């Protein structure tokens, strides 16, 4: 059948979130970085952060809360499982031992309801008596916070307003009152509701609804002393202690909207803010002799696009940037040209988001490196990840990295890019300005135009920044052989997308050739509209376009003519050609198996995944098994079911192999981290380097009963069942994973205790006991 | 084509529906021209007018054909014919609602729909009293009721169609319009309803058997005895029992009224023979279910109508009907043995009160006493044909003079009130005493003929051992 | 002053139970002395009066005459609190009234009727006339009686399960019209693309045959989403659809970094999918995911989702003023789109109707699925608390002729499955009430006698009645004269136990549209059938007989 071993090589480095507070002690501040599938405790020290233990968690953290309720010395961590499973966590120690226990447990999953695309908003009231959870638009679930409550149960309060932008609590009030901005067709406004546990309903708050801007989004809670509500829209920053209106509108905010914020002063006088670019801001609240007197803003320099900010001791702010590396920024009194009153105290590494990568062993002789296109724009950097073990060489491009392929005629790396220029004077100095040679394409058949920037392999310097025309946007890039010519041509599928048109009607696929430092054009093939990812079928350029999948034949007279006319496809977003099988990945038609026939001249539809799932990444393992990734973080391997009875079901791909992954795959590759039965790698957005090893039939049964017997012994924080979590989030079907081996659980056996090994090997007699301890080391030595 | 002219009408009306589904298509695109951003608007307008012309032309031909099928009139003919007119109302109802958007065309369907509901009100009423109102205690005298007793009546219609789950509740009203002086009032004192289930109607028929109908002794409010016993006596008063039939089928609210035959209701049981004579005199000269003044004027019926009328009193009661040889003596006993004419207008008073010579017995009392005695002893000698029945002495003494000697016969005595008698010829014809039912109670006439020997050959030559051999 | 003298006919013989009610609530008049209190001064000048007859009764005081028959007393039992299936009771009479309004409904929206959320707020408002522990058992029946006229009422006027069956037959006829596009000339390769939208090829893309059940699952709607969008890029290119084409084109490009789409596009319009609406009637259902239909004016989209949130587009389909809805379109209005002919635009219009009819088919299905569970939640919670109250009544009766009949029937309601299946459980629940011998203080005999008193204009128990019972009580005298709704017990519903199953609601009874043609029509004026008379009676007008005159017992006590 289809048996695969999914094992990770590196932990996710993208900072999903962070929360600070006295977790371990009452005086020791602790930064709990809630990353993907893990929660790491960091002791705030003079040197910065000090790790003690990283506690793994089932999937991402939807809601994270570090709060101390009335009568508690330790922060009560609140973790919401991605399968909507709420559990109150409590820190416990017995001799400098990191052992977080569980105060309460109860699932909050609902059978019906439209999920909030904005996100599940989880907040705790200032009185620490209820749980403010916004699961669905218009559906508020409140869990009674009691000291003697172990079963977490949330009742359904029908929020009158169907759709809301952001929900917050009114800090400073002596009642459970909230401040939320609802969304109406007549205009978005703010309202106050009372969450009374005695009536189980919403009630009129202190003041009525207020007329705000029709663009107001992020809501910043005003602390207890000042009182009120600060709502920042696209530009205006309004203040509403009561029926007072104090709105300041800085033009700089209009462009870069406020995304995150940070409370430096407990009073609320200094409130650090974060925009969508990285420029650091800080509000200045002055208590009018508490009502606000005036509101000012300042620029504190630019950082990597952040997401969650937490204030530490001695003026330290943790910048949890997801796009680009995360750096510990220490607030100081220094001043310069940009007035950046901040310094880079520490610098942490990051691998995601991996847009594109490839395994090249030119000077590696096996054990090829990983050129992950991490970050975007200014944070766009080619992290040269190479196993020794993983050394990371940051190559800053200051421009968005798009597609990268391997060129064997000039030992370089052709990387597409789309720099941002204010409408068109440039803004940031990208690699194009730092390049050697620049020219435009010949034919002609704010703004982010596509530009081809080929970078060397050893010098890491852009040799040619050959840009394209205006309104020219590429989507694919093939750097392999075409026809009988062994030279790796640069077939770039560009498109003439006009800013006034709404449908793709003009395009031009150009072909170039890199010859000893010179990007010389070959010819051009104008097309209709925008094209998608294309892969050369045995050298022959197989076109993708949109619905019409063609095969352009390369001749000897410099001409590319079409030879196929396949209209069954709707989208060629994930087109892969292996052997003779042509696998087109459609968004709605999912996996479609094709086959080219020279005697006919068209791809015959032989197999097709009957499930209409939204694909995200495809991969061809063998001639019958094909791995597919879904947008709902689920893996599935379909088998070739072309030998049935009815001619209708023969075109249906039987899905047997099914897996619950958790991460979003963006690109696939082929290789391994060892020089000289599986070599399938893929880059994820969260920064997880994954390896799929096609396990054999004799080795699949050795870990089948071992994984099932380990779920009832090694549990997570909250007595949560592992198999229950290992279920798909697919809307079509919610099923437990079948046909796969979870590598994560197998890894736990390497650092497991000594007497715990006999509890899982005594029920297996391989023709056993000590043999299972040696065979698990080979699964980790392959990367 | 008594059975083919109904099956072809189903596909004939359905043939128009084959063009109606295509007509709705032309009507759909016609309405699509509403707020169009226009030369195709007038093209579809004139095309829809010509497409709706042949629909109303062929439909008029099917209307005249459905009217000729009803004029022919068995139960199965109106079964399939009613289903044709029932489904026909479904295509015209949706066409009238679709013609409200200015199609000239809305008035063309109203004139055709008016003829559909008019024909439905004609065939339904035409469609009957199967079971006549008779009492369970009556032996062979139907159409006779009594106060305090119950009776049954079935107004089953030929139509065999009903609604999905609608119980067609119907009622029976008695003495509602026949309150004329001389008629008494009789009202049911118990439930007079009938719950007709759809199941027993779509497969069996619209059976409205009203049962358990009690009667009360009441008179007119304002005039009692004398007024209701004058022009019409208790035994001669006609009472028409109405039956309000309520038929509902897809909003077709119709309240029919099937009037039954007039009956005679008496207040006692000893007057059953006299009351039966008034019924026979009413269903002989006419056969109309609606009659008010019938016995007020003295009638005169000839002998041509009393022939087959008296034969029903022996054919149904015992078995053997009155042969023409028996009817020849009934005329001589009422008018004369030397009668030559047959158009003698016999009055009603000369039927039950005028004595019959030479016995000096009334005609009705003599015949009623005959059927009473022979129904308890002479029941096996009437059906098979061992006796000849009513034979006068004038005709019996004529045929015996042409036969052989030793033969005997069995006839009815005219000097007495009935019974049985014997006679034979040895020329001289003998006679015995008439034996009534009191003599046959201890010993029937079977052993009397055998052990008697003058009796030998029964009319004419049948040996006494072969005729009465099965009765031994 | 303005008195009223009834008249009872001798029809329908004499029952032993009816003789006790008449003797204790009616007085029969005989001569003139017994009727002299109402001003019956008869002048003996009338001819008929002198003829020994009691006719031409001369009256000094005008009154009201009612021609009451005994038959009407036998029907009274079907009009009382315990009528068709009602509970045996001061407020129970008004309960039967409003319950008939749910059943006898011509074409009113089934959503306007009280649902589970508001039904409970009234459960504690029921009052009773003489124990306190027995009031919880009587009130535990009306919680399930609402589902008898709707959920358990198959093929009846205005019902939710029966409304699904009409949508299946309408969806089949709708697909027959869209395959007739090519057949009818009035309506190249354009006639073959419409055939792919038919369910004959949609069900083949998954692996299920074309039956009467494939158009009800949730996975079937995911396959039709790809066939709809394929008719908007090839057949059409209007500026309305063109705006949504760039949205789905830039969506797949924003997914390369794992981010969403911020407020960047300023020329965007309110699409049909981003409509946030909810059914006010339903307690909690969530924002409906409206389909991504196009070719609709911005002024016609707001009015479409207005009725959807309120009456779910029912009146324009089945109800009043239904002829004007066909001139514009019941599922979607007749819109205008450029670059298309009257036949080109017609095709994509029928495809958008099936994209909305199939989406609405899952809405009405899911709403009853959620309701079947919402009704099961209060039913399972009621049987868990009502079995405890009756348990304390048994222990108190033992410590202090109907004692052994309580413990033998209290454990019989625990073996019910309460799930499908669940239809036969409600038939056996009402059988336990009849087995429980009620005390003489509270029986059905007295409840019936009290009913007649409320029907007259001389006695009244309650003046204020609920809105549902305002029109519902008009049906009580209707049943007395002619009982439209006869005893509907457990036995009748047992035979036709159509469980809430996809393979039972659509199938089963198919030829049930014959009675529906006259059912709704009958209920239109059924609220005005009340036998009452208030015309003044003079000396020589309305002449009847003295012996047939009848008066109530309360009329003699007032004089
Ligand atoms: Zn369009």
Q: Give DSSP secondary structure letters for A351-400.
A: --------EE-TTTSSS-EEEEEES-GGG-EEEEEE----EEE--B-SS-
Put simply, the answer to whether C249 touches A234 (Cβ < 8 Å) is no
Q: List Cα–Cα distances, A338 to A276, A342, A480, B130, in angstroms.
A: 18, 11, 46, 112
CA distance B194 to chain C (A): 14
In a domain, C122, yes or no: yes
| C254 and C384 inside one domain | no
Identify which of C173, C146, C148, C151 has the alpha carbon closest to the alpha carbon of residue C162: C151
Annotate A115-147 with b (16+ C-beta within 10 A) or e (fewer).
ebebebbbbbbbeebbbbbbbbbbbbbbbebee
Tallying the residues shown for chain C, one arrives at: 559
Verify that C404 and C481 share a domain, yes or no: yes
Q: Domains plus CATH for chain A?
A: 6-347 (2.130.10.10), 354-698 (2.130.10.10), 699-781 (1.10.150.910)
Helix (H, G, I), strand (E, B) or coil at A516: coil
For residues C333 and C374, membership in a common domain is answered with no
C257 closest CB neighbour out of A117, A136, A376: A376
Same domain, C262 and C150: no
Resolution in A: 4.8
Closest CA to A115 of A168, A172, A57, A62: A62
* Three-state DSSP string of chain B: CCCCCCCHHHHHHHHHHHHHHHHHHHHHHHHCCCCCCCHHHHHHHHHHHHHCHHHHHHHHHHHHHHHHHHHCCCHHHHHHHHHHHHHHHHHHHHHHHHCCCCCCCHHHHHHHHHHHHHHHHHHHHHCCCCEEEECCCCCCCCCEEECCCCEEEECCECCCCCCCCCCEEEECCECCCCCCCCCCECCCCCCCEEEECCHHHHCCCECCEEEEECCCCECECCECCCCCCCCCCHHHCCECECCEEEECCCCCCEEEECCCCCEEEECCCCCHHHHHHHHHCHHHHCCCCCCCCCCCCCCEECHHHHHHHHCHHHHCCCCCCCCHHHHHHHHHCCCCCCCCCCCCCEECHHHHCCEECCCCEEHHHHHHHHHHHCCCCCCCCCCCCCCCECCCHHHHHHHCCCCCCCEEEEECCCCCCCCEEEEEECCCECCCCCECHHHHHHCCCHHHHHCCCCCCEECCCEEHHHHCCCCC
Do C336 and B31 lie within an 8 Å CB cutoff?
no
Nearest to A415 by CA among A397, A393, A433: A397
CATH architecture designation of domain B131-269? Sandwich (2.60)
CA distance B349 to chain C (A): 33
Give the closest of C53, C336, C341 to B37, CB-based. C336
Facing C517 at nearest CB: one of B28, B34, B250: B250
For residue A665, say if its preceding peptide bond is cis, omega within 30 degrees of 0: no
Dist CA C445 CA B236 (whole Å): 48
Structure-block tokens of residue A486: 């062994």
Contact B222 C51 (CB under 8 A): yes
Residues C281 and C340 in one domain: yes
Partner-chain contact C242 A503, CB within 8 Å: yes
In a shared domain, residues C358 and C231: yes
Q: Is C257 exposed, middle or buried (0-12, 13-18, 19+ CB in 10 A)?
A: middle
Does the residue C185 lie in any domain? no
C276 Cα to chain A: minimum distance (Å)? 7
Q: What angle do CA A478, A482, A485 make, to 5 degrees?
A: 135
CA–CA separation, A217 and A329 (whole Å): 26
Test mutation, B25, B29, B35, B162, chain C, max C CBs within 10 A? B25
Running DSSP on this structure, what letter comes out for residue C433? H
- Touch test B–A: 3 Cβ pairs or more under 8 Å: no
Residue C220 and residue C330 in one domain: yes
Q: How far is the CA of C303 from the centre of ligand 1 (A)?
A: 21
Count Cβ atoms below 10 Å from residue B340 Cβ, excluding itself.
6
User: Domains in chain C: how many in total?
Assistant: 3
C16-22: which pairs have CB atoms within 8 A and are 24 or more residues apart? C17/C445, C18/C70, C18/C73, C18/C74, C21/C73, C21/C448, C21/C449, C21/C452, C22/C73
Q: Which amino acids of C are annotated as binding site for Zn(2+), given as ranges?
A: 236, 238, 241, 295
What is the C-alpha separation between A322 and A352, in angstroms, rounded?
A: 8
A260: CB partners within 8 A, 6+ apart: A273, A274, A306, A307, A308, A309
Same structural domain, C397 and C508: yes
Which of C352, C367, C382 is the last residue before a domain boundary? C367
Q: Which residue of C has its CA nearest to B213?
A: C12
Chain C residues within 8 A of B227 when measuring between CB atoms: none
* Residue of C321, C326, C544 to mutate for B, most B C-beta atoms under 10 A: C326
Residue C165 lies in a domain: no
Does C412 lie in the same domain as C316? no
Residues C389 and C297 in one domain: no
The verdict on residue C164 lying in a domain is: no
- What is the rounded distance in angstroms from the CA atom of residue C71 to the CA atom of residue C480? 9
Structural domain range at position C13: 4-63+536-557
Beta-carbon pairs below 8 A across chains A and C: 85
Cβ separation B164–C515 shorter than 8 A: yes
Ligand 1 centre to CA of A564 (Å) is: 29
Architecture of domain B8-126: Up-down Bundle (1.20)
Give the chain B residue nearest C336 (alpha carbons).
B36
Query: Mutation test of the interface with chain C: which of A502, A587, A631, A668, choosing the one with the most C Cβ atoms within 10 A?
Result: A502
DSSP A279: E
In a domain, C186, yes or no: no
* C322 to chain B: closest CA residue: B97
In a domain, C175, yes or no: no
Domain boundaries, chain B: 8-126, 131-269, 300-467
CB contact C247 to B (< 8 Å): no
The rounded distance, in Å, linking the Cα atoms of C555 and C559 is: 7
For residues B85 and C358, give the distance between their C-alpha atoms in angstroms, rounded to a whole number.
35
Residue C385 domain flag: yes
Both C54 and C82 in one domain: the answer is no
CA C70 to chain centre: 31
Tokens in use for A475? 């989507």
Buried b / exposed e across A171-200, counting CB within 10 Å, b at 16+? bbbeebbbbbbbbeeeebbbbbbbbeeeee
Cα separation of C558 and B296, whole Å? Answer: 55
For C236, nearest residue in chain A (alpha carbons): A503
Closest residue, chain B, to C339 (C-alpha): B37
Single out the residue in C346, C367, C388 at which a domain terminates: C367
Q: Distance between CA C181 and CA C351 in Å, rounded?
A: 11
- Contacts of C249-253 spanning 24+ positions with Cβ under 8 A: C249/A504, C249/A530, C252/A571, C252/A573, C252/A587
> How far is A101 from A90, CA to CA, in rounded Å?
5
Asked if C14 has any chain B CB less than 8 Å from its own CB, the reply is: no
- Out of C222, C277, C284, name the one closest to residue A732 (CB): C222
- B84 Cβ contact list (under 8 Å, min separation 6): B9, B10, B13, B66
CA atoms of B236 and B348, how far apart (whole Å): 11
Please state which architecture CATH assigns to domain B300-467. 2-Layer Sandwich (3.30)
Q: Which of A588, A633, A732 to mutate to test the interface with C (most CBs of C within 10 A)?
A: A588
Domain boundary among C367, C396, C431: C367
* Interface touch C242/A185, C-beta < 8 Å: no
Give A392-436 as a 3 state SS string: EECCECCCCEEEEEEECCCCEEEEEECCCEECCEECCCCCCCCCC
Q: What is the dihedral of CA C120, C122, C127, C132, to 10 degrees?
A: 20
| Same-domain check for residues C240 and C354 | yes
- Identify which of C320, C325, C286 has the alpha carbon closest to the alpha carbon of residue C304: C325
Residue C187 lies in a domain: no
């Amino acid at each position: 059948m289809s048996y695969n071993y999914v094992v990770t090589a590196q932990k996710p480095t993208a900072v999903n979130g962070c929360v600070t507070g006295h977790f371990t002690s009452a005086e020791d501040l602790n930064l709990l970085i809630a990353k993907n599938t893990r929660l790491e405790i960091y002791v705030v020290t003079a040197e910065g952060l000090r790790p003690v233990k990283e506690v793994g968690m089932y999937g991402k953290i939807a809601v994270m809360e570090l709060f101390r309720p009335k009568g508690e010395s330790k922060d009560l961590l609140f973790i919401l499982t991605a399968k909507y499973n709420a559990c109150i966590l409590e820190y416990k120690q017995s001799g400098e031992s990191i052992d977080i226990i569980t105060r309460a447990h109860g699932n909050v999953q609902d059978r019906i309801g439209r999920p909030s695309e904005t996100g599940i908003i989880g907040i705790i009231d200032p009185e620490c008596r209820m749980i403010g959870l916004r699961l669905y638009d218009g559906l508020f679930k409140v869990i009674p916070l009691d000291r003697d409550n172990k079963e977490l149960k949330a009742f359904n309060i029908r929020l009158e307003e169907l759709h809301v932008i952001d929900v917050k609590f009114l800090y400073g009030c002596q009642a459970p009152t909230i401040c939320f901005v609802y969304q109406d067709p007549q205009g978005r406004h703010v309202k106050t509701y009372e969450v009374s546990l005695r009536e189980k309903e919403f009630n009129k708050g202190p003041w009525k609804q207020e007329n705000v801007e029709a663009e107001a989004s992020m809501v910043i809670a005003v602390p207890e002393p000042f009182g009120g509500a600060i709502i920042i829209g696209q530009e205006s920053i309004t203040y509403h202690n009561g029926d007072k209106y104090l709105a300041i509108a800085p033009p700089i905010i209009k462009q870069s909207t406020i995304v995150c914020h940070n409370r430096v002063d407990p009073n609320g006088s200094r409130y650090l803010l974060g925009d969508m670019e990285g420029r650091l801001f800080m509000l200045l609240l002055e208590k009018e002799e508490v009502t606000l007197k005036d509101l000012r803003v300042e620029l504190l320099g630019e950082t990597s696009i952040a997401e969650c900010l937490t204030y530490l001791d001695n003026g330290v702010v943790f910048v949890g940037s997801r796009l680009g590396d995360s750096q510990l920024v220490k607030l100081n009194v220094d001043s310069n040209e940009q007035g950046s009153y901040v310094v880079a105290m520490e610098t942490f590494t990051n691998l995601g988001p991996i847009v594109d990568m490839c395994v090249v062993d030119l000077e590696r002789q096996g054990q090829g490196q990983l050129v992950t296109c991490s970050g975007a724009f200014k944070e766009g950097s080619l992290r040269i990840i190479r196993n020794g073990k993983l050394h990371i060489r940051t190559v800053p491009l200051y421009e968005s990295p798009r597609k990268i392929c391997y060129q064997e005629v000039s030992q370089c790396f052709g990387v597409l890019s789309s720099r941002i220029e204010v409408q068109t004077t440039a803004l940031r100095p990208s690699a194009s300005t730092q390049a050697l040679s620049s020219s435009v394409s010949s034919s002609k058949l704010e703004v982010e135009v596509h530009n081809l920037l080929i970078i060397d392999q050893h010098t890491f310097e852009v040799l040619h920044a050959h840009q394209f025309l205006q309104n020219e946007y590429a989507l694919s890039l093939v750097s392999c052989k075409l026809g009988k010519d062994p030279n790796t041509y640069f077939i770039v599928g560009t498109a003439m997308v006009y800013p006034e048109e709404a449908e793709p009607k003009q395009g031009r696929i150009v072909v170039f050739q890199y010859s000893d430092g010179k990007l010389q054009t070959v010819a051009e093939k104008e097309v209709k509209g925008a094209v998608y990812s294309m892969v050369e079928f045995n050298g022959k350029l197989l076109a993708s376009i949109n619905s019409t999948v063609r095969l352009y034949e390369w001749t000897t007279e410099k001409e590319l003519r079409t030879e196929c006319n396949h209209y069954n496809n709707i989208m060629a977003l994930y087109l892969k050609t292996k052997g003779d099988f042509i696998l087109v990945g459609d968004l709605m038609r999912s996996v479609l198996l094709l086959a080219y026939k020279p005697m006919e001249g068209n791809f015959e539809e032989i197999a097709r995944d009957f499930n209409p799932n939204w694909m995200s990444a495809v991969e061809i393992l063998d001639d019958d098994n094909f791995l597919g990734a879904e947008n709902a973080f689920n893996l599935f391997v379909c088998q070739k079911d072309s030998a049935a009875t009815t001619d209708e079901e023969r075109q249906h791909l039987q899905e047997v192999g099914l897996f619950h992954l958790g991460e979003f795959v963006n690109v696939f590759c082929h290789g391994s981290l060892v020089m000289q039965q599986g070599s399938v790698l893929f880059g994820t957005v969260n920064g997880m380097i994954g390896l799929v090893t096609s396990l054999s039939e004799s080795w699949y049964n050795l870990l089948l009963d071992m994984q099932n017997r380990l779920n009832k012994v090694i549990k997570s924080v909250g007595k949560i069942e592992h198999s229950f979590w290992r279920s798909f989030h697919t809307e079509r079907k919610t099923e437990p994973a079948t046909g796969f081996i979870d590598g994560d659980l197998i890894e736990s056996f390497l650092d497991i205790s000594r007497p715990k090994m006999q509890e899982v090997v005594a029920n297996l007699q391989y023709d056993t006991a000590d043999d299972l301890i040696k065979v698990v080391e080979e699964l980790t030595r392959i990367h | 084509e008594i059975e083919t002219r109904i099956l072809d009408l189903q596909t004939a009306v359905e043939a128009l529906v084959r063009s109606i589904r295509q007509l709705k298509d032309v009507q759909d695109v016609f309405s699509f021209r509403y707020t169009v951003l226009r030369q195709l608007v007038q093209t579809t307008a004139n095309e829809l007018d010509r497409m709706r012309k042949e629909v109303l032309d062929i439909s008029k031909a099917l209307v005249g054909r459905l009217t000729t099928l009803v004029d022919l009139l068995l139960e199965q003919w109106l079964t399939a014919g009613a289903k044709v007119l029932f489904h026909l109302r479904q295509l015209l109802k949706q066409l009238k609602d679709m013609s409200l958007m200015l199609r000239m065309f809305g008035q063309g369907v109203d004139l055709q729909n008016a003829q559909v509901t008019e024909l439905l009100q004609r065939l339904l009423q035409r469609s009957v009293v199967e079971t006549q109102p008779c009492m369970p205690q009556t032996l062979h005298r139907p159409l006779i009721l009594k106060t305090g007793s119950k009776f049954t009546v079935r107004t089953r219609l030929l139509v065999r169609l009903q609604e999905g789950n609608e119980s067609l509740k119907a009622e029976v009203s008695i003495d509602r319009n026949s309150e004329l002086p001389g008629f008494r009032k009789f009202n049911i004192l118990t439930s007079n309803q009938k719950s007709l289930t759809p199941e027993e109607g779509q497969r069996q028929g619209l059976i409205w058997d009203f049962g358990f109908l009690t009667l009360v002794e009441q008179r007119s409010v304002g005039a009692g005895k004398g007024s209701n016993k004058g022009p019409l006596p208790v035994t001669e008063e006609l009472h028409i029992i109405s039956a309000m039939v309520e038929y509902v089928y897809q909003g077709l609210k119709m309240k029919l009224q099937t009037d039954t035959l007039p009956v005679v209701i008496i207040s006692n049981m000893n007057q059953l023979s006299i009351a039966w004579a008034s019924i026979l005199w009413f269903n002989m000269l006419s056969s109309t279910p609606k009659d008010q003044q019938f016995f007020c004027k003295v009638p005169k019926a000839p002998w041509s109508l009393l022939g087959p009328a008296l034969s029903w009193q022996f054919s149904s009661y015992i078995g053997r009907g009155l042969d023409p040889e028996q009817l020849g003596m009934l005329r001589n006993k009422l008018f004369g043995k030397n009668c030559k004419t047959e158009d003698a207008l016999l009055s009603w008073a000369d039927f039950s009160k005028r004595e019959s010579p030479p016995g000096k017995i009334p005609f009705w009392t003599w015949l009623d006493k005959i059927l009473e005695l022979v129904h308890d002893h002479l029941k096996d000698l009437w059906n098979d044909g061992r006796i000849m029945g009513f034979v006068s002495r004038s005709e019996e003494r004529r045929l015996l003079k042409k036969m052989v000697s030793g033969t005997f016969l069995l006839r009815f005595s005219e000097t007495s009130e009935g019974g049985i008698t014997c006679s034979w010829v040895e020329v001289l014809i003998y006679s015995v005493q008439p034996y009534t039912k009191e003599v046959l109670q201890s010993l029937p006439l079977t052993e009397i003929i055998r052990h008697y020997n003058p009796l030998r050959f029964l009319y004419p030559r049948v040996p006494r051992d072969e005729a009465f051999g099965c009765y031994y | 002053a303005m008195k009223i003298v009834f008249e009872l006919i001798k029809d329908e013989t004499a029952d032993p139970f009816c003789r006790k009610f008449i003797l204790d609530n009616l007085v029969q008049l005989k001569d003139i002395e017994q009727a002299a209190r109402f001003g019956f001064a008869i002048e003996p000048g009338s001819e008929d009066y002198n003829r020994g007859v009691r006719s031409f009764i001369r009256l000094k005081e005008p009154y009201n005459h009612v021609e009451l028959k005994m038959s009407y007393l036998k029907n009274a039992r079907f009009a009382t609190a315990n009528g068709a299936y009602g509970i045996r009771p001061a407020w129970d009479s008004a309960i039967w009234g409003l319950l008939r309004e749910v059943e006898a409904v011509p074409y009113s929206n089934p959503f306007t009727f009280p649902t589970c959320e508001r039904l409970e707020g009234i459960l504690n408002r029921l009052e009773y006339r003489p124990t306190d522990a027995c009031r919880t058992l009587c009130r535990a029946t009306v919680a399930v009686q609402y589902a008898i006229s709707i959920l358990y009422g198959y093929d009846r006027s205005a019902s939710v399960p029966r409304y699904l069956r009409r949508l299946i037959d309408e969806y089949i006829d709708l697909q027959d019209r869209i395959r007739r596009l090519g057949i009818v000339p009035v309506l190249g390769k354009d006639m073959n693309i419409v055939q792919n939208v038919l369910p004959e090829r949609v069900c083949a893309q998954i692996g299920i045959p074309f039956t009467y059940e494939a158009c009800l699952l949730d996975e079937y709607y995911d396959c039709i989403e790809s066939n709809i969008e394929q008719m908007y890029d090839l057949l059409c290119m209007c500026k309305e659809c063109g705006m949504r084409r760039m949205e789905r084109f830039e969506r797949v490009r924003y997914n390369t970094i794992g981010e969403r789409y911020p407020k960047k596009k300023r020329d965007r319009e309110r699409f049909f999918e981003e409509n946030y609406v909810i059914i006010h009637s339903h307690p909690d259902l969530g924002v409906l995911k409206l389909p991504k239909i196009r070719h609709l004016n911005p002024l016609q989209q707001l009015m479409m989702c207005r009725y959807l949130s309120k009456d779910l587009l029912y009146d324009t389909q089945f109800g009043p003023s239904n002829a004007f809805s066909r001139a514009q379109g019941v599922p979607l209005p007749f819109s205008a789109v450029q670059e298309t002919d009257m036949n080109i635009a017609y095709a994509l219009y029928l495809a958008s109707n099936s994209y909305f009819m199939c989406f609405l088919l899952r809405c009405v299905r899911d709403v009853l699925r959620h309701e079947e569970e919402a009704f099961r939640k209060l039913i399972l919670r009621l049987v868990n608390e009502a079995v405890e109250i009756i348990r304390d009544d048994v222990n108190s009766r033992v410590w202090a002729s109907a004692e052994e009949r309580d413990l033998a029937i209290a454990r019989s309601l625990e073996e019910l499955t309460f799930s499908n299946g669940f239809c036969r459980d409600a038939a056996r629940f009402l059988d336990l009430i009849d087995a429980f011998h009620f005390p003489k203080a509270l029986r059905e005999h007295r409840a019936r006698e009290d009913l007649l008193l409320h029907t007259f204009k001389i006695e009244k128990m309650y003046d204020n009645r609920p809105l549902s019972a305002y029109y519902g009580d008009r049906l009580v005298p209707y049943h007395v004269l002619m009982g439209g709704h006869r005893r509907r017990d457990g036995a009748v519903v047992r035979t036709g136990g159509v469980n809430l199953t996809d393979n039972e609601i659509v199938r089963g009874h198919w030829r049930a549209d014959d009675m529906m043609n006259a059912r709704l029509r009958y209920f239109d004026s059924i609220d005005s059938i009340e036998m009452i008379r208030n015309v003044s009676i003079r000396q020589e007008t309305l002449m009847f007989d003295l012996d047939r005159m009848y008066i109530s017992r309360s009329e003699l006590e007032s004089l």
